[PDB]
Design an enzyme around this catalytic site. Structure first.
Site, PDB file in Angstrom:
ATOM      1  N   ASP B  36      12.941 122.339  74.237  1.00 45.80           N
ATOM      2  CA  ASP B  36      11.924 122.458  73.239  1.00 45.80           C
ATOM      3  C   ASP B  36      12.652 122.685  71.932  1.00 45.80           C
ATOM      4  OD1 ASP B  36      12.835 124.976  73.912  1.00 45.80           O
ATOM      5  OD2 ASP B  36      10.987 125.592  74.841  1.00 45.80           O
TER       6      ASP B  36
HETATM    7  C1  LIG Z   1       4.037 135.171  63.950  1.00 44.32           C
HETATM    8  C2  LIG Z   1       3.832 133.942  64.378  1.00 44.32           C
HETATM    9  C3  LIG Z   1       2.416 133.367  64.382  1.00 44.32           C
HETATM   10  O1  LIG Z   1       1.759 133.404  63.396  1.00 44.32           O
HETATM   11  N1  LIG Z   1       1.878 132.770  65.598  1.00 44.32           N
HETATM   12  C4  LIG Z   1       0.528 132.222  65.623  1.00 44.32           C
HETATM   13  C5  LIG Z   1       0.504 130.759  65.165  1.00 44.32           C
HETATM   14  N2  LIG Z   1       1.611 130.039  65.767  1.00 44.32           N
HETATM   15  C6  LIG Z   1       2.360 129.088  64.959  1.00 44.32           C
HETATM   16  O2  LIG Z   1       2.063 128.914  63.825  1.00 44.32           O
HETATM   17  C7  LIG Z   1       3.539 128.326  65.560  1.00 44.32           C
HETATM   18  C8  LIG Z   1       4.776 128.590  64.700  1.00 44.32           C
HETATM   19  N3  LIG Z   1       6.002 128.191  65.359  1.00 44.32           N
HETATM   20  C9  LIG Z   1       6.752 127.071  64.809  1.00 44.32           C
HETATM   21  O3  LIG Z   1       6.325 126.534  63.845  1.00 44.32           O
HETATM   22  C10 LIG Z   1       8.066 126.542  65.394  1.00 44.32           C
HETATM   23  O4  LIG Z   1       9.098 126.785  64.476  1.00 44.32           O
HETATM   24  C11 LIG Z   1       8.469 127.098  66.769  1.00 44.32           C
HETATM   25  C12 LIG Z   1       7.324 126.920  67.766  1.00 44.32           C
HETATM   26  C13 LIG Z   1       8.928 128.552  66.710  1.00 44.32           C
HETATM   27  C14 LIG Z   1       9.600 126.194  67.267  1.00 44.32           C
HETATM   28  O5  LIG Z   1       8.831 125.035  67.385  1.00 44.32           O
HETATM   29  P1  LIG Z   1       9.312 123.777  68.290  1.00 44.32           P
HETATM   30  O6  LIG Z   1       9.103 122.549  67.549  1.00 44.32           O
HETATM   31  O7  LIG Z   1       9.153 123.744  69.745  1.00 44.32           O
END
Ligand SMILES: */C=C\C(=O)NCCNC(=O)CCNC(=O)[C@@H](O)C(C)(C)COP(*)(=O)O
Ligand SMILES: */C=C\C(=O)NCCNC(=O)CCNC(=O)[C@@H](O)C(C)(C)COP(*)(=O)O
Lengths: 405, 76, 407, 75
Positions: B36
């Site tokens: 991932d």
């Molecule tokens: C504190 C975090 C939060 O707000 N979570 C709730 C919403 N989730 C997101 O917004 C997802 C954010 N994550 C990303 O954007 C990515 O950088 C990762 C998922 C951490 C890594 O992504 P990959 O492409 O697998």
């Protein structure tokens, strides 16, 4: 209204890596405290700890441990145990909106918060940090790192209340069942064991320091010459389940949770007030028609803390005090994991009809006198037991558990 | 006799947890293997430990494929 | 009949205001709270932008109380002082009262002081340099412990922690305490410190915005085609959650009733949300609520992965009758643990003063955000029912639904 | 002009009291409302000021204005 029972448990602690080993240690009065090179090399005055004696290597899938600190690892292994012990299969608990998980730690992971900062300030800078520090270090790490691999769909979060942490987690699980929101909730906690966190407690003067050469004697609750608690690590998990749901699948039921107390002192930041503890125990005993047969006291082996609780105990029970032992004399202080572990100890005692000894009481404290403090393993038929958990910030938790009939 | 030639495969193999034979040189990290976007980051890092070089961000995300990794090290 | 819960007071310290009036003005104007940060740049991070609190906190709190506190506790403490005054509660009314409690937490405790402690220990003075106050600052329950003691709280006392959903679950839990009849009042909220020690951990993930450092107020840009991660922020917030009959009868001012609370888990991906969990969460909060949702404060952190998943979940819940949607994080940045309670407060102001705050910086609306009534300009309207989403790592979900009281 | 009367100043800051309330034979606990943990931090503060380590059972039983000044002289 709905009733809640324990139908499975799991534990990784200083006195055993499962309920069989732990049961044996409780009967023995064995101590889980050992000397610690790590604490000494760090510069601390305290050199004793209640460490987990287990090689965790390979026990958890790689895609799963990459997110975990030690607290999560202990809690995860305890959860694997609890699931099997409840006889639950993946179809029974995964992808199920009526099955949830409430587990936390007292301090998350200081080790990895520091590692992240060290990596950042060393060369390479951001490149040395890696993408796994947040999940290891955040306060909700234990719940986040478990709910995902176990496919939990119900409630999912961590309670944090210092040394009362996993007790409030169990209490909250009961409330989830009482409110009709969940059929099963996995409840518990974990705590890593490291100088990064341990040193902060020593800087308070809260840790035992005068018994380094004889570690098994360091933790000595109710003794006249106690000098603070012995820090410890580990995890624990119990399966909290609605009554009719448990009966219908022929689950094994350890006990019903018939009482849960949660209160605040609103007085002193680090020293208990007694008033709050009295209200807590009374709150847990409300509507409980049987008497308390055994009480697992919080009893950390600190000079200030141990007798305060005894004074509170007297006030609640008067002349009809229950049998009392502080298992932390064997186990050391597991911080966030203490609540669920001590609940498990109490459940084991209730299940196998005995009382574990409160050991290392060489000279009983003068203010500890007119009470039933047990110092030798003693067989008995128990029906109702109580376990106290108190934390910094004047936060209190009490659980009352009773055999089903 | 021969000092090894491009254990890149090993790094990828251990990082992504595969049986070495599955690391095909035309194998892409995401669509096969099963990594991932967080797995990717750790793999770029691991390729820096081994191979004592640094890889700039705008370089590291042209890297997907096992080859792209080989390609990148060679000439650096 | 089961007990009902209302909000009768609030307090807030955020990047767009140090009280509810300052916040109200910033919300109507669509003012950014984001600025450039030297601290983040000097640490080596790729993200140089901040949702900082613009306030010198020195001396605001008594010596004997602040000696135990990290910034999360301080922001939460100041928000609580506001909430108490705003609820018209006197010391006699809420102190030394077994039926008055407090549920407030942070997402990550205090990395700053945990690091400070390790540095002191590894320095020349070792144990002598640490001091006796690191535990109380660094532990996960610091925000609840550092508040319940000076405010003489006697009821329930602990912290919920669920990453970016933290203070949302705290409010929901506060509601449950009232429903169960255990408490008359529960103070609920949270705080989060703002520091490189914690921010860098998010940066190493690739979660933070990095391409807009030269234009800080444009960095947080939810639903924009060219968004690149969230802008970390700090602050605190507290709301007074109160049993209905207890509040009505002491002539309290009531902002809204909490008519819904959802809490679910994905059990799927650690850092990437699944659609199904959020759908169940929103549906759970809307259950037994006969009016429609007029406004939805979306979680919407401005990540490529996160923003479109939430929208997909929204579509599935409402279908063609979607409510008005704006992401205030475009102004405020991401407060992590404090986000839930702050965004609840924003929604309550919108409900109290009859307007919808804009979702700003949407230059190019994302392909997958089409036809969903995303509001981009401040819009007056009489609202009755609002919704706020909070999601966290580990696939943890929380939703609150609030509605005006009748008569 | 520096005396050695700052010990008074340090105690003043740490315990958050008005310099005149500091008076040589004033006790930390019984008069200046210091506790358990305040004690620990003040001993530390007396070391940042006045480069000198104070051993654990040396720095305890100090406890009143007098003995803080007393100790530091000849140290
Ligand atoms: C504190 C975090 C939060 O707000 N979570 C709730 C919403 N989730 C997101 O917004 C997802 C954010 N994550 C990303 O954007 C990515 O950088 C990762 C998922 C951490 C890594 O992504 P990959 O492409 O697998
Ligand atoms: C996590 C801590 C915990 O278990 N809290 C509940 C039990 N209470 C105690 O153990 C008593 C608190 N301990 C103390 O006050 C002392 O050990 C110090 C912290 C060292 C303070 O010394 P002072 O003279 O008060």
């Amino acid at each position: 209204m709905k009733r809640a029972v324990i139908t499975g448990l799991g534990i990784v602690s200083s006195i055993g890596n499962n309920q069989q080993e732990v049961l044996a240690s409780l009967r023995e009065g064995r101590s889980g405290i050992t000397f610690s090179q790590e604490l000494k090399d760090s510069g601390m005055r305290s050199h004793v700890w209640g460490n987990v004696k287990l090689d965790t290597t390979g026990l958890i899938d790689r895609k799963v441990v990459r997110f975990m600190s030690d607290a999560s690892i202990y809690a995860f292994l305890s959860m694997e145990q609890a699931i099997a012990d409840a006889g639950l299969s993946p179809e029974a608990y995964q992808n199920n909106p009526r099955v949830g998980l409430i587990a936390g730690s007292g301090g998350g992971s200081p080790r990895f918060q520091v590692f992240g900062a060290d990596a950042m300030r060393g060369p390479r800078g951001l490149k040395a940090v890696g993408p796994y520090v947040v999940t290891k270090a955040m306060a909700s790490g234990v719940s986040a790192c478990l709910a995902t691999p176990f496919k939990i769909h119900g409630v999912n979060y961590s309670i944090s209340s210092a040394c009362a942490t996993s007790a409030h987690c169990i209490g909250n699980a009961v409330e989830q069942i009482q409110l009709g929101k969940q059929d099963i909730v996995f409840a518990g906690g974990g705590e890593e064991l490291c100088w990064e966190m341990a040193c902060e407690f020593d800087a308070m003067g809260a840790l035992s320091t005068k018994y380094n050469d004889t570690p098994e004697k360091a933790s000595r609750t109710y003794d006249a010459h106690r000098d603070g608690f012995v820090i410890a690590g580990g995890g624990g998990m119990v399966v909290v389940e609605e009554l009719e749901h448990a009966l219908a699948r022929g689950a094994h039921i350890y006990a019903e949770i018939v009482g849960y107390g949660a209160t605040s002192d609103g007085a002193d930041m680090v020293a208990p007030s007694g008033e709050g503890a009295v209200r807590c125990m009374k709150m847990a005993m409300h509507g409980v028609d049987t008497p308390i047969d055994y009480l697992n006291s919080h009893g950390t082996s600190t000079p200030v803390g141990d007798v305060k609780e005894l004074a509170a105990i007297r006030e609640v029970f008067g002349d009809k005090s229950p049998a009392i032992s502080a298992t932390k004399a064997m186990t050391g202080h597991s911080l966030g994991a203490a609540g669920v572990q001590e609940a498990i100890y109490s459940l084991l005692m209730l299940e196998h009809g005995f009382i574990a000894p409160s050991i290392n009481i060489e000279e009983l404290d003068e203010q500890a006198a007119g009470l039933n403090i047990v110092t030798e393993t003693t067989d008995r038929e128990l029906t109702t037991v109580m376990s106290n958990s108190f934390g910094f910030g004047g936060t209190n938790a009490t659980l009352v558990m009773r055999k089903l009939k | 006799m021969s000092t090894i030639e491009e254990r890149v495969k090993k790094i990828i193999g251990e990082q992504l947890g595969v049986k070495q034979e599955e690391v095909t040189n035309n194998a892409s990290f995401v669509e096969d293997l099963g990594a991932d976007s967080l797995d990717t980051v750790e793999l770029v890092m691991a390729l820096e430990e081994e191979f004592d070089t640094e890889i700039p961000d705008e370089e590291a995300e042209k890297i997907t494929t096992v080859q792209a990794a080989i390609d990148y090290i060679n000439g650096h």
